[PDB]
Design a protein around this ligand. Sequence first.
Ligand SMILES: CS[C@@H](C)[C@@H](NC(=O)[C@H](CS)NC(=O)CCC[C@H](N)C(=O)O)C(=O)O
Ligand SMILES: [Fe+3]
Length: 328
Amino acid sequence: VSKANVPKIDVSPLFGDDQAAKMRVAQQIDAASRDTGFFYAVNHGINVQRLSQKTKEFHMSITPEEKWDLAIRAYNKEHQDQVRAGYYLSIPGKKAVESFCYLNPNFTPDHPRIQAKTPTHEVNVWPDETKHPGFQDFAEQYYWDVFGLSSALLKGYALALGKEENFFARHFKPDDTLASVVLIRYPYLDPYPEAAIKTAADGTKLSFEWHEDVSLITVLYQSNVQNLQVETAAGYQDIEADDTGYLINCGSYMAHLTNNYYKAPIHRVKWVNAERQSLPFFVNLGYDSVIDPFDPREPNGKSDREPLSYGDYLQNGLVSLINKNGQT
Ligand SMILES: CS[C@@H](C)[C@@H](NC(=O)[C@H](CS)NC(=O)CCC[C@H](N)C(=O)O)C(=O)O
Ligand SMILES: [Fe+3]
């Protein structure tokens, strides 16, 4: 397969007050969004080597007893409130992947949306402090660091579409965002179970099938082991790895609001027998957020699509993705 066009864009102007420089970044985001749908964010300000080291100290020290105690509902019937947040177990001999998901640290027991039991809002669960010293405080601080990067990126997407810079960011707030971090471990295994390997129609061995993302945008750190592919008009292409930057793409909410001007790219995960990390931040809005759909290709900007609230979008999308590609 040939190599996918994935440009490196320096996103540092998006943090400052130089309006013309921000426009130059916006144009590069527009070009990448109309082409393969992917780019690397560089000069982002975040210490990704320390993120990798802290995440590795956690995955490698957590015990089977602690994983049952933190497990989501799909693995532990006792934990009916845990649909999104908590531990997603491996199944030795059948399923290789395992992961930990956490939500907004402001979703405390006194938060009005947790009091009302609104779908998609949960209070995070954490391992014992004495067993994992410093982990919960590191992980909460990381949520705010990648939140800050994502707010800057959202300024560049708004400019790219001909809008004012707070068009998306106004709907992305500390007190109510539905955004999530997932710390995915893909393990080295000897022998690697064949039941954990899927085969595409074209014969390619996979760990996760073709899909579009459920997000507005996705903001991803990975290790330096090549595995991602993107569908283009020329067929599936390889995305090169870069463990110093963040890989960015649009999810299906952005394709809805823009009448498919910025498509949600179809992508998949090749099977590789290597110990590695996939650490996505899914940029989601608030439960009642609505952006009216438009079409930047039409003279009058009007679209034949209906408004959809972010909450309804997120709940149905996460269920459909489990029915399509399986419980992770
Ligand atoms: C290249 S796709 C990627 C970054 C990842 N998959 C995923 O993270 C898959 C597909 S996007 N996403 C999901 O499984 C959605 C998880 C939602 C989360 N529990 C929440 O509650 O917000 C992986 O397999 O590396
Ligand atoms: Fe994805």
